[PDB]
Point group: C2
Chain length 339, copies 2
């Protein structure tokens, strides 16, 4: 058995069907927020639907994901014992108020303020203390309730994330670590490349990939059986790039912003409207180029390669962002079949 | 004794004074080019001045630097035995036609086409073969002439460069390896940071620095006594950055292009015209910010720290780009005093 974990925005919860629910092992609900050192759920609208989802697939684990890109409050909460206890208490509140099986913490990222949030060098030690305290509180509630409650994280994929955390300690408190092996090239670079590539390609100045990320986290002390890799149901896109090398590893005037989601790629871009699909046999990744606009994405082909890698390397499974980005339903099917 | 090596454009050779020449151990003349698999010098104008420069400082070693950013022809020449022999023959031509002591090869970079030049995965093996062949030819000419002829390279600072070369083999043919520990953050990223920083700073998504680069090359098999680190007499600059964290580690709409040279920074920017100088005590690097425009540079303070690092770590010395970028003469003086 492997993890098949899908991020689902609260807004998309009613769109889940029984057939889709049976293909997932986990749903990560996006997103709770942090205010006053506590996880907040009051803005989420569809949490009353959770018992019915669990009835449709009783093997499904439903986590509340807390944070996301630009969600603040984490460095502040982790900086004091009081704030770490408050976060732990609010995680317990979430799993007792709603049919939630645990919490997925998505602080992006300890020590890093680039998303417009507070950060501190103290976050490296404080993140470990925060997760320990949250795990302690969730375990106490699981003792009361006669069950297990889950704690996971979503982690950045590259060296910076290892440098800002103590992953050998962090992993001890987590059921698994989800490596966000997407947006690996995106809004901070003007060089085109693959945003969610299985392997690193020759000629790329940037050296990250799923394979390189897994290796970093294994060497940092995360057991392979706890590593869940990432698939993206959407693209990253660079504009006004020279018509050289099919747009790959070329300089844009701007960074790689979000491109079309997979729904829109299938409808409007893949081998259409001047865009040609190319396959990078080294990276195991597809890309589109029309002579000027470069688009990096995941498809059924790269997903199959990612699944084969999970099996061969004995990893935990795969997660994806995000359910609503592929209304063709093909990418979830490919993940389910591959694992 | 330490290497004090300065890049000097051919156009700036007549500006060299005796006092400056006595402070340098090496001059790298920028730049010869590659055409038809051969080093070309016909566009350079001041090579007849070299005997007088050597007369003024008989201990000075004068190298011809070949290549530079966007200079093509290297992957093509290195791809065949004929082209490798042609490069070697043309290096011998350079040192017999002019008062040159050797060649500094500045291919940027083997396996990488990002500068708008040809590249191939075969460059990794072919670069070693090219340097071996050039060293063999230069040694044969040194045997005829009763002297040593030099061969060095300028190398990219980050992981990509290690991945595109065989540095443990490459180093055997070189008098030293100049690590271009500048432009380390620049035209490929929209996140601000230090372009020529001694140490890596907390909170930077990008993890390179002089210290990290030296460690990469040592681990790749370059002896410390062959490592020459880099200082920059000019800035990298990002525009329209949020007024947060003094501009450091903030996102710009564009990449880090060239900023003012040190002459212009001293005249117009350092603690002037709204720009405040800050010192990063972790990275050992100065930076300027006026609330909107972020400028990274080297000064006498960071240069002293770089020199102390060279001495403590037992490296070969320091090189700089480029002589004409600092008409205050202070940065060369700081380097000379520090070593």
């Amino acid at each position: 058995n492997y993890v098949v974990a899908g991020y689902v925005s609260d807004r998309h919860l009613p769109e889940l069907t029984k057939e889709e629910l049976k293909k997932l092992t986990h749903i990560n609900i996006a997103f709770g927020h942090v205010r006053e050192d506590r996880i907040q759920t009051g803005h989420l609208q569809n949490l009353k639907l959770l018992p019915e989802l669990k009835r449709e697939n009783p093997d499904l684990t439903i986590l509340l994901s807390v944070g996301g890109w630009s969600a603040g409050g984490f460095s502040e909460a982790a900086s004091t014992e009081a704030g770490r206890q408050a976060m732990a208490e609010s995680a317990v509140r979430a799993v007792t108020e709603y049919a939630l099986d645990g919490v997925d913490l998505d602080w992006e990222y300890p020590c890093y303020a680039e998303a417009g949030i507070a950060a501190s060098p103290d976050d490296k030690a404080n993140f470990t203390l925060l997760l320990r305290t949250m795990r302690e509180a969730l375990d106490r509630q699981g003792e009361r309730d006669g069950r297990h409650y889950w704690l996971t994280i979503a982690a950045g994929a590259d060296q910076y994330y290892i440098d800002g955390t103590e992953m050998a300690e962090v992993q001890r408190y987590l059921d698994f670590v989800q490596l966000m092996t997407y947006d690996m090239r995106g809004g901070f670079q003007t060089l085109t490349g693959h945003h969610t590539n299985l392997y690193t390609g020759t000629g790329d100045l940037f050296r990250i990939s799923v394979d390189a990320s897994v290796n970093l986290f294994v060497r940092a002390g995360v057991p392979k059986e706890k590593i869940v890799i990432g698939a993206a149901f959407y693209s990253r896109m660079w504009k006004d790039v020279p018509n050289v090398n099919r747009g790959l590893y070329q300089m844009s005037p701007g960074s790689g912003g979000y491109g079309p989601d997979f729904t829109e790629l299938a409808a409007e871009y893949i081998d259409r409207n001047g865009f040609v699909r190319y396959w990078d046999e080294e990276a195991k990744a597809p890309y589109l180029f029309d002579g000027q606009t470069f688009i990096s994405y995941d498809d059924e082909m790269s997903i199959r390669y990612k699944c084969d890698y999970v099996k061969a390397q004995e990893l935990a499974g795969v997660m994806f962002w995000e359910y609503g980005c592929d209304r063709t339903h093909r990418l979830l099917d490919a993940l389910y079949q591959g694992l």
